[PDB]
Amino acid sequence: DYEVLYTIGTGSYGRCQKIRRGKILVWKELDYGSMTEAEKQMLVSEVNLLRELKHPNIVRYYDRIIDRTNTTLYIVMEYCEGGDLASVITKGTKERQYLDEEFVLRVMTQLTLALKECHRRSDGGHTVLHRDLKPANVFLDGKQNVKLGDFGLVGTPYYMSPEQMNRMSYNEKSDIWSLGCLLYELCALMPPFTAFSQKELAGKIREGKFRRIPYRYSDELNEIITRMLNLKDYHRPSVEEILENPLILEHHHHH
Numbered sequence: 001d002y003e004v005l006y007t008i009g010t011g012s013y014g015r016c017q018k019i020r021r022g023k024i025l026v027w028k029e030l031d032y033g034s035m036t037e038a039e040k041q042m043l044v045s046e047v048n049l050l051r052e053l054k055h056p057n058i059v060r061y062y063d064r065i066i067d068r069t070n071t072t073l074y075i076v077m078e079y080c081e082g083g084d085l086a087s088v089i090t091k092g093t094k095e096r097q098y099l100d101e102e103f104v105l106r107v108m109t110q111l112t113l114a115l116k117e118c119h120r121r122s123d124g125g126h127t128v129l130h131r132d133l134k135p136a137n138v139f140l141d142g143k144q145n146v147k148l149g150d151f152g153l154v155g156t157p158y159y160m161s162p163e164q165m166n167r168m169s170y171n172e173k174s175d176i177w178s179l180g181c182l183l184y185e186l187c188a189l190m191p192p193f194t195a196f197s198q199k200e201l202a203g204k205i206r207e208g209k210f211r212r213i214p215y216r217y218s219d220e221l222n223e224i225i226t227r228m229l230n231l232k233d234y235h236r237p238s239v240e241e242i243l244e245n246p247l248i249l250e251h252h253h254h255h
Protein backbone atom coordinates (compact mmCIF):
# COMPACT_ATOMS: atom_id res chain seq x y z
CA ASP A 1 0.00 0.00 0.00
CA TYR A 2 1.04 3.67 -0.41
CA GLU A 3 0.74 7.15 1.08
CA VAL A 4 -0.74 10.13 -0.81
CA LEU A 5 1.45 13.24 -0.75
CA TYR A 6 -0.75 15.47 -2.91
CA THR A 7 -2.65 15.74 -6.16
CA ILE A 8 -0.43 16.77 -9.05
CA GLY A 9 -3.39 17.45 -11.32
CA THR A 10 -6.24 15.96 -13.34
CA GLY A 11 -5.79 14.45 -16.81
CA SER A 12 -8.46 13.38 -19.29
CA TYR A 13 -8.18 9.83 -17.90
CA GLY A 14 -8.68 10.93 -14.31
CA ARG A 15 -6.69 12.28 -11.37
CA CYS A 16 -2.92 11.81 -10.90
CA GLN A 17 -1.42 11.91 -7.41
CA LYS A 18 2.14 11.99 -6.12
CA ILE A 19 2.50 9.05 -3.72
CA ARG A 20 5.17 7.40 -1.57
CA ARG A 21 5.79 3.71 -0.82
CA GLY A 22 9.99 5.55 0.87
CA LYS A 23 10.02 5.36 -2.93
CA ILE A 24 8.28 8.29 -4.64
CA LEU A 25 5.83 7.33 -7.38
CA VAL A 26 2.55 8.44 -8.90
CA TRP A 27 -0.68 6.63 -9.50
CA LYS A 28 -3.31 7.24 -12.16
CA GLU A 29 -6.87 6.98 -10.85
CA LEU A 30 -9.01 5.20 -13.43
CA ASP A 31 -12.63 5.20 -12.28
CA TYR A 32 -14.48 2.16 -13.68
CA GLY A 33 -17.63 2.85 -11.69
CA SER A 34 -19.89 4.29 -14.39
CA MET A 35 -18.86 1.55 -16.80
CA THR A 36 -20.85 -1.42 -18.06
CA GLU A 37 -19.36 -4.92 -17.86
CA ALA A 38 -18.30 -4.51 -21.50
CA GLU A 39 -16.62 -1.12 -21.00
CA LYS A 40 -14.74 -2.34 -17.92
CA GLN A 41 -13.49 -5.27 -20.02
CA MET A 42 -12.10 -2.91 -22.67
CA LEU A 43 -10.37 -0.92 -19.92
CA VAL A 44 -8.69 -4.06 -18.59
CA SER A 45 -7.52 -4.90 -22.11
CA GLU A 46 -5.96 -1.49 -22.76
CA VAL A 47 -4.31 -1.32 -19.36
CA ASN A 48 -2.94 -4.85 -19.80
CA LEU A 49 -1.59 -3.84 -23.22
CA LEU A 50 0.10 -0.68 -21.96
CA ARG A 51 1.36 -2.49 -18.82
CA GLU A 52 3.74 -4.58 -20.96
CA LEU A 53 5.71 -1.66 -22.42
CA LYS A 54 9.24 -1.42 -21.04
CA HIS A 55 11.80 1.16 -22.14
CA PRO A 56 14.18 3.65 -20.49
CA ASN A 57 12.31 6.46 -22.29
CA ILE A 58 8.79 5.27 -21.47
CA VAL A 59 7.27 6.02 -18.04
CA ARG A 60 7.77 2.77 -16.13
CA TYR A 61 4.78 0.71 -14.98
CA TYR A 62 5.13 -0.59 -11.44
CA ASP A 63 1.87 -2.01 -10.18
CA ARG A 64 -1.91 -1.91 -10.24
CA ILE A 65 -4.31 -1.55 -7.32
CA ILE A 66 -7.92 -2.66 -7.62
CA ASP A 67 -9.92 -0.69 -5.07
CA ARG A 68 -13.45 -2.03 -5.14
CA THR A 69 -14.80 0.36 -2.50
CA ASN A 70 -13.65 3.36 -4.58
CA THR A 71 -14.53 1.62 -7.79
CA THR A 72 -11.08 2.68 -9.00
CA LEU A 73 -8.13 1.10 -10.72
CA TYR A 74 -4.95 2.79 -9.45
CA ILE A 75 -2.06 2.48 -11.89
CA VAL A 76 1.24 2.96 -10.06
CA MET A 77 4.00 4.48 -12.18
CA GLU A 78 7.38 6.15 -12.23
CA TYR A 79 7.48 9.71 -10.88
CA CYS A 80 9.36 12.07 -13.20
CA GLU A 81 11.17 14.68 -11.13
CA GLY A 82 11.86 17.01 -14.07
CA GLY A 83 8.22 17.79 -14.91
CA ASP A 84 6.91 17.96 -18.49
CA LEU A 85 8.29 19.28 -21.81
CA ALA A 86 5.48 21.85 -21.94
CA SER A 87 7.06 23.75 -19.04
CA VAL A 88 10.45 23.68 -20.76
CA ILE A 89 8.83 25.33 -23.77
CA THR A 90 7.06 28.01 -21.70
CA LYS A 91 10.36 28.58 -19.86
CA GLY A 92 12.19 29.21 -23.15
CA THR A 93 9.52 31.70 -24.15
CA LYS A 94 9.79 33.58 -20.85
CA GLU A 95 13.60 33.68 -20.90
CA ARG A 96 13.71 34.50 -24.62
CA GLN A 97 16.15 31.62 -25.01
CA TYR A 98 15.76 28.97 -27.71
CA LEU A 99 16.71 25.41 -26.74
CA ASP A 100 20.16 24.25 -27.87
CA GLU A 101 20.13 22.01 -30.97
CA GLU A 102 21.85 19.34 -28.85
CA PHE A 103 18.90 19.21 -26.46
CA VAL A 104 16.41 19.05 -29.33
CA LEU A 105 18.35 16.13 -30.83
CA ARG A 106 18.24 14.31 -27.49
CA VAL A 107 14.49 14.76 -27.28
CA MET A 108 13.95 13.67 -30.89
CA THR A 109 16.21 10.65 -30.45
CA GLN A 110 14.71 9.46 -27.12
CA LEU A 111 11.07 10.02 -28.12
CA THR A 112 11.71 8.16 -31.35
CA LEU A 113 13.25 5.26 -29.41
CA ALA A 114 10.19 5.24 -27.12
CA LEU A 115 7.82 5.17 -30.12
CA LYS A 116 10.00 2.53 -31.77
CA GLU A 117 9.36 0.20 -28.83
CA CYS A 118 5.62 0.91 -29.24
CA HIS A 119 5.42 0.61 -33.05
CA ARG A 120 7.99 -2.23 -33.18
CA ARG A 121 7.63 -4.28 -29.97
CA SER A 122 10.99 -5.75 -28.88
CA ASP A 123 9.21 -8.65 -27.21
CA GLY A 124 6.84 -10.11 -29.77
CA GLY A 125 3.99 -8.02 -28.36
CA HIS A 126 1.00 -6.23 -29.87
CA THR A 127 1.74 -2.87 -31.55
CA VAL A 128 0.70 0.20 -29.59
CA LEU A 129 0.22 3.75 -30.82
CA HIS A 130 0.59 6.59 -28.34
CA ARG A 131 -2.40 8.60 -29.67
CA ASP A 132 -1.87 11.67 -27.43
CA LEU A 133 1.67 12.80 -28.17
CA LYS A 134 2.12 16.41 -27.03
CA PRO A 135 4.57 18.28 -24.74
CA ALA A 136 2.28 17.78 -21.70
CA ASN A 137 2.60 13.98 -22.10
CA VAL A 138 6.37 14.03 -22.32
CA PHE A 139 7.94 13.89 -18.89
CA LEU A 140 11.54 14.41 -17.77
CA ASP A 141 13.67 12.67 -15.16
CA GLY A 142 16.27 14.37 -12.98
CA LYS A 143 18.80 14.47 -15.83
CA GLN A 144 16.16 15.68 -18.28
CA ASN A 145 15.98 12.35 -20.06
CA VAL A 146 12.69 11.84 -21.90
CA LYS A 147 9.96 9.71 -20.32
CA LEU A 148 6.97 9.31 -22.65
CA GLY A 149 3.77 8.81 -20.68
CA ASP A 150 0.02 9.22 -20.40
CA PHE A 151 -0.78 7.01 -23.37
CA GLY A 152 -4.07 7.88 -25.08
CA LEU A 153 -6.89 5.64 -23.88
CA VAL A 154 -8.36 23.90 -29.37
CA GLY A 155 -6.79 25.73 -32.28
CA THR A 156 -3.76 23.43 -32.05
CA PRO A 157 -2.33 20.93 -34.62
CA TYR A 158 -1.93 18.21 -31.98
CA TYR A 159 -5.64 17.48 -32.17
CA MET A 160 -5.82 17.63 -35.94
CA SER A 161 -3.66 15.15 -37.86
CA PRO A 162 -4.33 15.01 -41.63
CA GLU A 163 -5.66 11.47 -40.98
CA GLN A 164 -8.40 12.89 -38.77
CA MET A 165 -9.10 15.56 -41.40
CA ASN A 166 -9.45 12.89 -44.07
CA ARG A 167 -11.44 10.36 -42.05
CA MET A 168 -8.73 7.74 -41.98
CA SER A 169 -7.74 5.68 -38.97
CA TYR A 170 -5.02 6.93 -36.64
CA ASN A 171 -1.85 5.06 -37.61
CA GLU A 172 1.86 4.99 -36.78
CA LYS A 173 2.46 7.95 -39.12
CA SER A 174 -0.17 9.87 -37.15
CA ASP A 175 2.17 9.47 -34.13
CA ILE A 176 4.99 10.78 -36.35
CA TRP A 177 2.91 13.85 -37.31
CA SER A 178 2.44 14.64 -33.62
CA LEU A 179 6.16 14.12 -33.03
CA GLY A 180 6.78 16.64 -35.82
CA CYS A 181 4.43 19.15 -34.17
CA LEU A 182 6.11 18.61 -30.81
CA LEU A 183 9.68 18.97 -32.08
CA TYR A 184 8.69 21.96 -34.19
CA GLU A 185 7.22 23.56 -31.08
CA LEU A 186 10.34 22.75 -29.06
CA CYS A 187 12.47 24.65 -31.66
CA ALA A 188 10.21 27.59 -32.51
CA LEU A 189 8.52 27.88 -29.09
CA MET A 190 5.23 27.85 -30.99
CA PRO A 191 3.29 25.14 -32.87
CA PRO A 192 3.60 25.05 -36.68
CA PHE A 193 -0.08 25.89 -37.31
CA THR A 194 -1.94 28.41 -35.18
CA ALA A 195 -5.58 29.52 -35.38
CA PHE A 196 -8.61 30.73 -33.41
CA SER A 197 -10.99 28.03 -34.68
CA GLN A 198 -10.86 24.45 -35.99
CA LYS A 199 -11.98 25.70 -39.42
CA GLU A 200 -9.18 28.24 -39.69
CA LEU A 201 -6.75 25.63 -38.34
CA ALA A 202 -7.93 23.03 -40.88
CA GLY A 203 -7.37 25.61 -43.61
CA LYS A 204 -3.79 26.24 -42.49
CA ILE A 205 -2.96 22.55 -42.24
CA ARG A 206 -4.58 21.81 -45.60
CA GLU A 207 -2.19 24.32 -47.15
CA GLY A 208 0.63 22.45 -45.35
CA LYS A 209 2.67 25.65 -44.96
CA PHE A 210 4.52 26.99 -41.90
CA ARG A 211 7.65 29.03 -41.08
CA ARG A 212 11.10 27.43 -41.06
CA ILE A 213 12.27 26.61 -37.55
CA PRO A 214 14.69 29.31 -36.26
CA TYR A 215 18.00 29.72 -38.11
CA ARG A 216 19.66 28.66 -34.85
CA TYR A 217 18.91 25.15 -36.13
CA SER A 218 20.75 23.29 -38.88
CA ASP A 219 19.19 22.69 -42.29
CA GLU A 220 19.32 18.96 -41.51
CA LEU A 221 17.18 19.27 -38.35
CA ASN A 222 14.70 21.55 -40.10
CA GLU A 223 14.38 19.04 -42.89
CA ILE A 224 13.66 15.97 -40.72
CA ILE A 225 11.06 17.85 -38.62
CA THR A 226 9.47 19.20 -41.84
CA ARG A 227 9.38 15.67 -43.21
CA MET A 228 7.30 14.53 -40.23
CA LEU A 229 4.83 17.30 -41.15
CA ASN A 230 4.15 16.05 -44.68
CA LEU A 231 0.40 15.94 -45.42
CA LYS A 232 0.68 12.45 -46.95
CA ASP A 233 1.37 9.88 -44.21
CA TYR A 234 3.49 7.81 -46.62
CA HIS A 235 5.79 10.81 -47.06
CA ARG A 236 6.50 10.92 -43.30
CA PRO A 237 9.51 8.95 -42.04
CA SER A 238 9.05 5.80 -39.92
CA VAL A 239 10.87 5.62 -36.59
CA GLU A 240 13.65 3.68 -38.38
CA GLU A 241 14.11 6.39 -41.00
CA ILE A 242 14.26 9.07 -38.31
CA LEU A 243 16.94 7.17 -36.33
CA GLU A 244 18.98 6.69 -39.53
CA ASN A 245 19.43 10.46 -39.77
CA PRO A 246 23.12 11.57 -39.69
CA LEU A 247 22.37 14.12 -36.93
CA ILE A 248 21.54 11.41 -34.41
CA LEU A 249 24.62 10.20 -32.55
CA GLU A 250 25.35 7.85 -29.62
CA HIS A 251 25.40 10.57 -26.96
CA HIS A 252 21.90 11.74 -27.95
CA HIS A 253 20.59 8.41 -26.55
CA HIS A 254 21.11 9.27 -22.85
CA HIS A 255 22.27 12.29 -20.82
Ligand SMILES: CN(C)C(=O)c1cccc(Nc2nc(OCC3CCCCC3)c3[nH]cnc3n2)c1
Residues within 6 Å of the ligand: 008, 009, 010, 011, 016, 026, 059, 077, 078, 079, 080, 081, 082, 083, 084, 139, 149, 150
Ligand atom coordinates in the same frame (compact mmCIF):
# COMPACT_ATOMS: atom_id res chain seq x y z
C1 LIG B 1 1.91 19.84 -14.50
N1 LIG B 1 3.07 19.02 -14.23
C2 LIG B 1 3.70 18.29 -15.31
C3 LIG B 1 3.58 18.97 -12.86
O1 LIG B 1 3.01 19.62 -12.00
C4 LIG B 1 4.82 18.14 -12.43
C5 LIG B 1 5.88 18.81 -11.81
C6 LIG B 1 7.00 18.09 -11.38
C7 LIG B 1 7.07 16.71 -11.59
C8 LIG B 1 6.01 16.03 -12.20
N2 LIG B 1 6.14 14.60 -12.37
C9 LIG B 1 5.22 13.71 -13.01
N3 LIG B 1 4.02 14.10 -13.42
C10 LIG B 1 3.17 13.23 -14.02
O2 LIG B 1 1.87 13.63 -14.48
C11 LIG B 1 1.63 15.11 -14.31
C12 LIG B 1 0.14 15.39 -14.28
C13 LIG B 1 -0.59 14.46 -15.25
C14 LIG B 1 -2.15 14.91 -15.46
C15 LIG B 1 -2.22 16.38 -16.06
C16 LIG B 1 -1.58 17.37 -15.08
C17 LIG B 1 -0.07 16.93 -14.63
C18 LIG B 1 3.57 11.91 -14.20
N4 LIG B 1 2.97 10.81 -14.75
C19 LIG B 1 3.81 9.79 -14.66
N5 LIG B 1 4.93 10.20 -14.08
C20 LIG B 1 4.83 11.53 -13.76
N6 LIG B 1 5.62 12.48 -13.16
C21 LIG B 1 4.88 16.75 -12.61
